RNA sequence: GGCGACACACGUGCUACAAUGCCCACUACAAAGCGAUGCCACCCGGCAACGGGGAGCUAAUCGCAAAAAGGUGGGCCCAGUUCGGAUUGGGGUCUGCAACCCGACCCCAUGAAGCCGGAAUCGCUAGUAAUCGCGGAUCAGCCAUGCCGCGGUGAAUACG
RNA sequence: CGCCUCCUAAAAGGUAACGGAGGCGCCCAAAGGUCCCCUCAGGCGGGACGGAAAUCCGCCGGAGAGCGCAAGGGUAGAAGG
């Protein structure tokens, strides 16, 4: 490249529950982010925390229980 | 030289599999990334040329690389312009430096987008390039939301040596690109 | 409020009683 | 709203003209004048002539409206705009 | 630290903060931090990562969020569509669906203001 | 089924636009009324509306019942911000063949417009104005913010 | 009423009519000299605010772009950027 004003880019880490990304040479060096994913969370390995549905469970089947009128 | 996950990724699980899909008989004609590029257009930077000022290191700090400013081709007096008019800044990234984007941007970057149920799969332009482009900025980890102002979105884009999209579906995928299956 | 439904103030003016004012002073 | 102390369905006038079309076939159309009633859970498919003041309009039961009465699917009032 | 999406509350008190968060009222977020245990007094700029965390890990799985919860009401909205009840043509309208005399003053999911000619002048 | 329809216009009211203010906990002090084909003391279950048991009361001896403003203490730091509560989703409790058009509430989320009102216009001369709650009538229940009454704190001003 | 361009103009040139149809009385210290580099308009897909095109990819596109201004000649193996 260049000199003048360019980030040098030097080796940096990068912390979150999901843990520590060892390499990922970036500028600002050990930043601080909310999450990371395609680690363990976020939906890409099927987490469903409500798992919204109620067109079957409470209004199909197992009825007689209570009421209608949507989920 | 340096050294990035990435494309160890790619020379350990992503580039092996690939020549056992399609039965590539020489090790060239699987499907190879160089030369991404980020475009920002800023349209309505068109009254302002200290926007632009406030922007161009804001992006060179997610690639690690200054961008150029692209001016206007022609004119429409719909849009406030002249022949000049600095509107839109795009910037490419190859070796090394595009695979160090990437890396931040499917685990870091991605997630930030509210209500991500997965990419548009169909955004192939029929040759092997995936395009998308963003409407938030400060997904990026590099941006501390205390030194921003204004809000602006970017369109990378994106690059293969698949003659097509079908080769690159895969090259998506096996890289951790999340897309609507 | 006098009106809002969920406060002292608002259920004397209605005249009903819940979680934000039980039935024990 | 009954809160569970006392089931649901109400009227006795149509049920009794809707428990044995399922056991026997030919599904036919009905009129009736019991707008208060609830809908009927296990007679998916079929079709009532609700009264809504003065002509029974059909209604085809579907799958999503299990829940809601009968008496929402038949509008006492029209409107069609008012900008002539 | 984000615990809430991107859009999150935060500079001086948690207690009433995160009351800012659609799908998050007075009542749960009261319900939600004595749980974890967090002082209600204390403000969110001075905090240990290690609760900021631990709430990032109690009220976005037990319910849904902000964007999440807006597209199941949304959907609702839609779900009470094309099926022709009550609640859904009045939706459709525009109108007010609980009563709510629509002769004099109800404004407030009509819109604005229009005028028309109005005889005798 | 309609009298409650709504692209509109007007009158009467209610709650607000906040810091001589809002919320939470504790603590006081009234008058007038009503109630054994009812008021419900007191427990138990439910965050709650309420439900199950169940004592007394033909009632200046029982119940409605808690009065609120006020007082003590704490939080908020004046930002459409725990001001403000509309509108909408879900879940519910009672009355009643029976609550969608047409109820009343309870809970969890919404928490919008409004930051002091153009031209005009109303009420009041001493415990009134302002502000604060309570009861009764009809009524199974109720859209009662209405109406009829009761008390608490308590101004200013009137040359003419 | 003078000047430029096309036609009439009959294949060198030239050629008239109160014949057909337009422009000019300027502009530029960069729009000039040289050296170096670069290739257009359009069409098709793809892509946040983006619409018939604001900026960007990836193909197709030898001239229809552009060459300050009318028109003609000419031009990318550039006089264009
Ligand atoms: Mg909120
Ligand atoms: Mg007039
Ligand atoms: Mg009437
Ligand atoms: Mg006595
Ligand atoms: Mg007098
Ligand atoms: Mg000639
Ligand atoms: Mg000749
Ligand atoms: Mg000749
Ligand atoms: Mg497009």
Redesign the pocket.
């Known amino acids: 490249m260049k000199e003048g004003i360019h980030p040098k880019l030097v080796p940096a880490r990068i912390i979150c529950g999901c843990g520590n990304v060892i390499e990922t040479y970036s500028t600002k060096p050990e930043i601080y982010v909310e999450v990371c994913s395609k680690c363990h969370p976020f939906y890409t390995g099927q987490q469903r925390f409500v798992d919204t549905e ?1 067109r079957v469970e409470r209004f199909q089947r197992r009825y007689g229980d ?2 209608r ?3 | 030289p340096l050294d990035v996950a990435l494309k160890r990724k790619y020379y350990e699980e992503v580039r092996p599999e690939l020549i056992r899909r399609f039965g590539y008989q020489n090790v060239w004609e699987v499907p190879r990334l160089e ?1 991404v ?1 980020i ?6 930077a ?1 009254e302002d040329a200290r926007i632009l000022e406030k922007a161009a290191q804001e992006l060179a700090l997610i690639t690690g690389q200054k961008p150029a400013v ?5 004119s ?1 007096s ?4 002249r022949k000049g008019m600095p ?4 910037v490419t990234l190859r070796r090394d430096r595009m695979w160090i984007f990437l890396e931040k941007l499917l685990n870091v970057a991605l997630p930030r987008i509210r209500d991500f149920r997965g990419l ?1 799969p ?6 092997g ?7 938030e900025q400060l997904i990026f980890p590099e941006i501390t939301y205390d030194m921003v102002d204004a809000l ?4 990378i ?3 293969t040596t698949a003659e097509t999209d079908e080769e690159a579906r895969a090259l998506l995928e096996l890289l951790g690109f999340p897309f609507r299956k | ?23 024990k ?1 | ?6 089931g649901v369905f ?2 006795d006038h149509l049920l009794e003209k809707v428990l044995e079309l399922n056991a026997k076939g030919e599904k036919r159309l009905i009129k009736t004048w019991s ?2 009633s609830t809908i009927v859970p296990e007679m998916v498919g079929h079709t009532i002539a609700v009264y ?2 003065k002509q029974h309009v059909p209604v085809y039961i579907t799958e999503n409206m299990v829940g809601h ?4 699917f ?1 509008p ?2 029209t ?1 069609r705009g ?2 002539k | 630290a984000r615990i809430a999406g991107v859009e999150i509350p935060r500079n ?2 948690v207690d ?1 903060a995160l ?11 009261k ?1 939600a931090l004595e749980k974890t245990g967090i002082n209600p ?1 204390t403000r969110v700029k001075d905090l240990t990562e290690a609760e900021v965390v631990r709430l990032r890990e109690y009220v976005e799985n037990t319910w849904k969020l902000e964007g999440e ?1 807006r597209a ?2 949304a959907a ?2 839609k779900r ?1 569509m094309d099926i022709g009840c ?2 859904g043509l009045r ?1 459709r ?1 525009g ?10 003053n ?1 404004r ?9 000619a ?1 005889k005798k002048k």
């Open positions: 109620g209570s009421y009128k949507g989920r | 030369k590029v475009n920002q257009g800023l349209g309505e068109k692209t001016r206007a081709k022609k429409i719909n849009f406030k312009l509107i839109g800044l795009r548009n169909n955004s192939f332009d029929g040759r390039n995936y395009n998308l482009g963003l409407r602006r979105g970017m369109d884009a994106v690059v | 409020g006098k009106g809002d439904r969920r406060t002292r103030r608002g259920k004397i003016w209605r005249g009903t009683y819940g979680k934000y004012r039980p039935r002073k | 709203p009954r809160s569970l102390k006392k109400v009227d707008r208060r809504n003041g009465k009968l008496g929402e038949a006492t009032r409107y008012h900008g | 001086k008190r009433v009351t800012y968060i659609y799908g998050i009222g007075k009542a749960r977020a319900e007094a919860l199941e009401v609702n909205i009470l009550y609640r939706h309208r109108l007010p669906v609980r009563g709510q005399r629509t002769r004099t109800a407030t999911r009509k819109g604005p203001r229009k005028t028309v109005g």
